[PDB]
Amino acid sequence: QSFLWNVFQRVDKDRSGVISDTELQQALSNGTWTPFNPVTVRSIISMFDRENKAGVNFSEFTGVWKYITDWQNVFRTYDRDNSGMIDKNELKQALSGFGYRLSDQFHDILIRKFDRQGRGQIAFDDFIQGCIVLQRLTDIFRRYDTDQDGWIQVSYEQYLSMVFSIV
Amino acid sequence: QSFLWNVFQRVDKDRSGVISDTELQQALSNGTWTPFNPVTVRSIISMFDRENKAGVNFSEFTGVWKYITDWQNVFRTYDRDNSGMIDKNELKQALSGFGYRLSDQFHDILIRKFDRQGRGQIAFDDFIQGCIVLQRLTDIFRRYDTDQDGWIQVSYEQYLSMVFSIV
């Protein structure tokens, strides 16, 4: 815990015992010399903050640290030329490793939706956000696919509630 | 146009000929003495700005003005006690007037999703945002409901693209 405590003290710049969105963003590198995607930061804090305080305490931060390190290790695996972005094939391999079953064309769609750099590849911070969204959307789809055939049938109002649950 | 020009000059506080999100928000009342929902502001500017400039010029602003006034007139109709919020029954009537076909229970869901004031009713600014979202989601549903029976059948990847189109 000593290592993690030392890291926590450095990130918690106001020394309040709660790391904010701004503090976490400032402590994170996306490997492209631009500020770490604040939407990704918001997602991560929101997932690990158990008390609706717009931040993480030390115990929650240990979760954040492991989460971010785990994502780093995935991205490091697949960014084969260490360019700071992964291409459609590298992304394909990454997501297939997770068990996703997606067509070649979908990988282009995902890159376009989340790549803030406008290069047709995806940087680390944007990759986490895309994956978070993909996981949430896939969890929701799994709930409605009652016979596991890769299709859902939903009414207008089921659909509205489905979209509202994203969130 | 004279009236609209005079209004435009007053809202365009920096006198640049482009009204920003912050300028529009500052010029709008939600009737509850709290700042007008910035998400609603973002939606409205984004819809009327034809040039990706984070704002509206005078001609676009005439559209904004009409849009906001039209919404005001709907809300004024249905806020029968002039309290500044509409209840589930008032909302039901409002949306039915638009031609929406929604169950009584859905109106509770919509209020919960969009009411920032936490009163179980919905204020003007939040009502616009809810309606904007409802219209977009209903347009998307209409695209997929190929036989107009109020149901859709979609594959996993169709569903992902559907959600990605929201936006």
Ligand code: NA
């Ligand atoms: Na802090």
Ligand code: NA
């Ligand atoms: Na690369």
Ligand code: NA
């Ligand atoms: Na199914």
Ligand code: NA
């Ligand atoms: Na201005």
Ligand code: NA
């Ligand atoms: Na009322």
Ligand code: NA
């Ligand atoms: Na149908």
